[PDB]
Write a protein that binds this ligand. Sequence first.
Ligand SMILES: Nc1ncnc2c1ncn2[C@@H]1O[C@H](COP(=O)(O)CP(=O)(O)OP(=O)(O)O)[C@@H](O)[C@H]1O
Ligand SMILES: Nc1ncnc2c1ncn2[C@@H]1O[C@H](COP(=O)(O)CP(=O)(O)OP(=O)(O)O)[C@@H](O)[C@H]1O
Lengths: 281, 281
Amino acid sequence: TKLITTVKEMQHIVKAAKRSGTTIGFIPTMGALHDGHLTMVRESVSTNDITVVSVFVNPLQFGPNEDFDAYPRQIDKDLELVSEVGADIVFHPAVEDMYPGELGIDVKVGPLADVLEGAKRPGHFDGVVTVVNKLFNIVMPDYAYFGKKDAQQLAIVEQMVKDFNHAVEIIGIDIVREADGLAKSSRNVYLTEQERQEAVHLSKSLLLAQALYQDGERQSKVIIDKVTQYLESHISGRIEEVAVYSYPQLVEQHEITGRIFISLAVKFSKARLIDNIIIGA
Amino acid sequence: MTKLITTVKEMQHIVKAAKRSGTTIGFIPTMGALHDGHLTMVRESVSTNDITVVSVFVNPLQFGPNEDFAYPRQIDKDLELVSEVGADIVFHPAVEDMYPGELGIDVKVGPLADVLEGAKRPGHFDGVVTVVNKLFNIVMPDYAYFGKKDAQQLAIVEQMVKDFNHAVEIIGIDIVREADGLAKSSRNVYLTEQERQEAVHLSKSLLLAQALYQDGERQSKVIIDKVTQYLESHISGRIEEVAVYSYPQLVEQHEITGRIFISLAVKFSKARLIDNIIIGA
Ligand SMILES: Nc1ncnc2c1ncn2[C@@H]1O[C@H](COP(=O)(O)CP(=O)(O)OP(=O)(O)O)[C@@H](O)[C@H]1O
Ligand SMILES: Nc1ncnc2c1ncn2[C@@H]1O[C@H](COP(=O)(O)CP(=O)(O)OP(=O)(O)O)[C@@H](O)[C@H]1O
């Protein structure tokens, strides 16, 4: 399983793939890989002739007082993990190769980034679309795999593909969880023993929101209050968001109709975790 | 005879088949009303590449808000002209297929758009890079051809290719001229008989600028002033700009060093004409 560390060689490999009719699946990551990423890699290896995983800690999607320096890095272990699952290439470019000085053209997300995590993390999704756009032009995949844990990111990337006419098909994969329900995340390693036990209540609060909805609740305020109160009595973390928005349109709902997602953001000591559930037709 | 392709889907299909076959693609984006300047680029592409695609698309995002349907439409004649040169495909998508909704992601040019025509029409070059980025993702050319007549545009498009990691190589084609030196353009017909004779002094003023430079002039101000005075005494039209900037960086300096370009914009009765020359090492 090949570690490719320059844009030029990645391009060369891709061009040769196209010429031979080799289909390409692509899983963009920031490394520190876990079973959530491997689930995407597994699906790609089933569907496509070659599978490329990028590991690139993208500085543009980290803001002030976030965790860019602390972000776990373990490229050898990452390469081993995806090798075991049948991946062909790990694409791991230098920051300077991806960003050789200042960008002359700027890519910015509109209304989809004015709410939720786009409001909580100013410029974050601008950073994501910037790097994903570049990676799609480098790897030229037939399919690109993303996780529904970052539901807002998924909707934004799908819009970008539409807006830019990228030939790539986006596949969103269901949230992969620990046995106790905790959503898999490279940032889970930042959790202390006790926070890890508390963090399971994010997922439990979403099952609570789902039951409330199942039993006929449609007032977002009631769901949000019941979820918030539940989290408050079970976790030491700061509850940054509990929200009910249409999906994938991302417009705040007051009285619930249509397809929605109920989303959470919680700040523990160092770990900032998110989770969601998508409900309705 | 060139095939007129009027949907993104069919254009994508043809490109996908070419990549599998190892067929190389040259691409010339235009807004139609084709003349010898365009055809030189097409000829260049036919010599180099297996297939040659010419787009004809009047892009609304690079016109001002009050502009109607003046820009000439003549797809049959344009198609006949590029067929005669050996082009394979004319790509002519509907504005609604290129721009089906509100864009969810916006592309903005940085400091390359802050001078010259970008300064006069903020958003013009945003509109150019938007359409060009889309067309590159649709056509996936190996080479794309742009005229040096629009030197700022060329620099901006090259920067975008680098920023976005498009695999395309950009080829700048020299300004094609009439025997007397007038840069070729649809607008030339609009010149009155006496104005058409005056309009030759755009090109002559650039030759003056080059002569002054070769004689050792290095203050941008003096070149601007001497070119401006020459022009004003030979034309009845109004000077809109005479400018001196580094190329391709588009930065001004009192004392000329390195490669520069001198650009002109003149408004006659009904025709707005531009010309430029790139000189120095
Ligand atoms: N638990 C999970 N289930 C499914 N997909 C997941 C997932 N966790 C992350 N992903 C997906 O994996 C891709 C790479 O995300 P990365 O940020 O590189 C790792 P992460 O730490 O797991 O996500 P996070 O940093 O947002 O917590 C994204 O498309 C993301 O949605
Ligand atoms: N005289 C010339 N020599 C070389 N290239 C030219 C040229 N005139 C136009 N081009 C090139 O043709 C391409 C498409 O131009 P269009 O977008 O159709 C507007 P235009 O053709 O510049 O109007 P015009 O009729 O005033 O030339 C551009 O890359 C442009 O620079």
